[PDB]
Curated annotation (Swiss-Prot):
Protein name: Metallo-beta-lactamase IMP-1
Primary subcellular site in the record, as a coarse category: periplasm
Entry keywords, A to Z: Antibiotic resistance, Hydrolase, Metal-binding, Periplasm, Signal, Zinc
Broad class of enzyme this protein falls into: hydrolase
NCBIfam families noted in UniProt: bla_class_B_core, bla_subclass_B1, blaDIM_SIM_IMP, blaIMP
PANTHER family from the UniProt entry: ACYL-COENZYME A THIOESTERASE MBLAC2, METALLO-BETA-LACTAMASE DOMAIN-CONTAINING
Gene3D superfamilies listed in its UniProt record: Ribonuclease Z/Hydroxyacylglutathione hydrolase-like
CC cofactor: Zn(2+)
Record-listed Zn(2+) 2 binding positions: 85, 162, 201
Taxonomic source organism: Serratia marcescens
Length: 227
């Protein structure tokens, strides 16, 4: 990229569907290496919504600038859970008067962590961030207590966030393996029609990713009985 030194990989902005872009950012995360984090930028008639933020303030300005530079007013940001791979750019967007959204639970968990909260918050299993266009859904505790997914109804796309772990559940300290199968069950129950499922840390797949995550969630409940 355009810098002066070694290389943590640059932010990626790739067009998924007609009004849906994927964004990938990368962070050193001890016990793992470079971790990729996928989010979405959803478009409505000249307005952009960040589904999750990049890891850092730095890539968040990057992502916002790209779309502002192509004619889009950044109309808001939804964080899918309180971990910094979804929330790490909330402070930047707050200082720029861009509405940041998170679930009431995400904001209290942000609070207990001493992190900056999203400015708006929603309470309840549902929340239309933009009615008939972006839907927030709470399948239940899993990756974290507060993790949510974001559904686009005219594209049948499902940002699963870190709740979707097709090939292994990953970091487990803040997780609820006992509740995760039930949420993964109820998630596929509602969004079986997912044409595309964008997870946080694995590449975009399809409806089976709901099936793959379900069966990985129940596999961790199995491994619970180790002694
Ligand atoms: Zn997480
Ligand atoms: Zn994550
Ligand atoms: Zn990727």
């Amino acid at each position: 990229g355009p810098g002066v030194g070694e290389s943590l990989p640059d932010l990626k902005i790739e067009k998924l569907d007609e009004g849906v872009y994927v964004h990938t950012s990368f962070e050193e995360v001890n016990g793992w290496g470079v971790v990729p984090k996928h989010g979405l930028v959803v478009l409505v008639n000249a307005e952009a919504y960040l589904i999750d933020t990049p890891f850092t303030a730095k890539d968040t300005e990057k992502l916002v600038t790209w779309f502002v530079e192509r004619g889009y007013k950044i109309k808001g940001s939804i964080s899918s859970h309180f971990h910094s791979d979804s929330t790490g750019g909330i402070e930047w967007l707050n200082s720029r008067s861009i509405p940041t959204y998170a679930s009431e639970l995400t904001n209290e968990l942000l609070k207990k962590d001493g992190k900056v909260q999203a400015t708006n918050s929603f309470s309840g299993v549902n929340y239309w961030l933009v009615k008939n266009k972006i839907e927030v859904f709470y399948p239940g505790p899993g990756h974290t207590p507060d993790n949510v997914v974001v559904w686009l109804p005219e594209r049948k796309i499902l940002f699963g966030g870190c709740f979707i772990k097709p090939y292994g559940l990953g970091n487990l300290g803040d997780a609820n393996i006992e509740a995760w199968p039930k949420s993964a069950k109820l998630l596929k129950s509602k969004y079986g029609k997912a044409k595309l499922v964008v997870p946080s840390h694995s590449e975009v797949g399809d409806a089976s990713l709901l099936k793959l995550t379900l069966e990985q969630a129940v596999k961790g409940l199995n491994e619970s009985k180790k002694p």
